[PDB]
Amino acid sequence: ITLPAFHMPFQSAGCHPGLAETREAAWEWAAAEGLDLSVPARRKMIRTRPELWISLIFPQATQAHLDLFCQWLFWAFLVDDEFDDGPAGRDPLMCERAIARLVDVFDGAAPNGPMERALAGLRDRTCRGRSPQWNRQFRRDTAAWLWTYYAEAVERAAGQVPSRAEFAKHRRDSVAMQPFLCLHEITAGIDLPDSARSLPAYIALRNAVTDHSGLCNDICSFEHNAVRLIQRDRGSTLQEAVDEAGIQLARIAERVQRAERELIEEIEAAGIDGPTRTALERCVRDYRGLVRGDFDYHAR
Numbered sequence: 461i462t463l464p465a466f467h468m469p470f471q472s473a474g475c476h477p478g479l480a481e482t483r484e485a486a487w488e489w490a491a492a493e494g495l496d497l498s499v500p501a502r503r504k505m506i507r508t509r510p511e512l513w514i515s516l517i518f519p520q521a522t523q524a525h526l527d528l529f530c531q532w533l534f535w536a537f538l539v540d541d542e543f544d545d546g547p548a549g550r551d552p553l554m555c556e557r558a559i560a561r562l563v564d565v566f567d568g569a570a571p572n573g574p575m576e577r578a579l580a581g582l583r584d585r586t587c588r589g590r591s592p593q594w595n596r597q598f599r600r601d602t603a604a605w606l607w608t609y610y611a612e613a614v615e616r617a618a619g620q621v622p623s624r625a626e627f628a629k630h631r632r633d634s635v636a637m638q639p640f641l642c643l644h645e646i647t648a649g650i651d652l653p654d655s656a657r658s659l660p661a662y663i664a665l666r667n668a669v670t671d672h673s674g675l676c677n678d679i680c681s682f683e684h685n686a687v688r689l690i691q692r693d694r695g696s697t698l699q700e701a702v703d704e705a706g707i708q709l710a711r712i713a714e715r716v717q718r719a720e721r722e723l724i725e726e727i728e729a730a731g732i733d734g735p736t737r738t739a740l741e742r743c744v745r746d747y748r749g750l751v752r753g754d755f756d757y758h759a760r
């Protein structure tokens with residue numbers, strides 16, 4: 461099986477030069493928080509290279525922000541380890557209790573255990589002092605990701621296979637891109653008001669950056685996989701399905717470009733200026749780099 465022709469018109473924003481530092485800080489943070497990874501979990505984490513993904517997405521961030529973002533991703537991989545191939549990933553009853561505890565700690569509940577203490581420390585470092593608008597959007601994307609493990613478990617227990625569109629709308633909340641877009645507002649020094657978040661072209665742009673990451677992750681990992689759902693929808697071969705997914709990924713990258721053009725038009729038509737225009741134009745500038753940075757991580 462070969463990787464298909466990728467239509468990547470977006471230029472690279474570079475790789476953060478503090479990649480080795482943020483990897484050392486991440487593992488030292490894990491040891492400080494008492495996150496005793498097992499031998500299979502450690503080998504997976506080293507192989508996964510979370511410092512490479514976080515350095516390609518935020519190549520211009522401060523070393524402090526890079527460390528905090530990388531520890532969010534480090535912690536998220538440990539969450540995925542215990543809810544996708546763990547004892548709680550099968551039983552929806554244990555999955556419901558375990559996810560509900562995390563979203564409670566994320567809302568300020570008293571932590572219990574190494575994983576909950578790490579989430580509480582990550583939350584207080586990231587959320588304390590930021591606007592209610594940012595926290596409301598950040599909790600929504602983070603809670604939706606945590607609850608997708610419960611949705612996959614219940615859908616698995618019910619023998620229900622996801623739809624084509626419902627999987628793409630599940631994949632948005634289950635991918636890492638949506639919480640990253642919230643962390644991007646931190647490092648870029650912007651804060652979007654609810655009016656800007658309600659712009660049609662910005663919503664289409666944010667979803668396109670998210671859709672591209674989710675499909676690109678599934679292509680580079682060909683269950684609840686987009687390439688597998690394409691092979692089943694068409695009865696094709698694995699190579700034909702992968703090549704078909706590469707075409708859909710090209711249509712998503714085109715959706716990024718059209719959403720960027722329409723977002724500029726909506727800015728000038730709505731009379732947006734001041735800090736809000738700087739924030740939206742900053743997204744038009746950076747979101748191409750997020751797509752390329754996420755692409756270079758998965759594909760390479």
Ligand SMILES: CC(C)=CCC/C(C)=C/CC/C(C)=C(\F)COP(=O)(O)OP(=O)(O)O
Pocket residue numbers: 532533536537539540544602605634635636637639640643677678681
């Ligand atoms: C909440 C904050 C601030 C940061 C965390 C951001 C998130 C959601 C990181 C998730 C990390 C990640 C890609 C996984 F756990 C795998 O999901 P994947 O979609 O790749 O599933 P697979 O298709 O690989 O099985």
Ligand SMILES: [Mg+2]
Pocket residue numbers: 540544
């Ligand atoms: Mg997973």
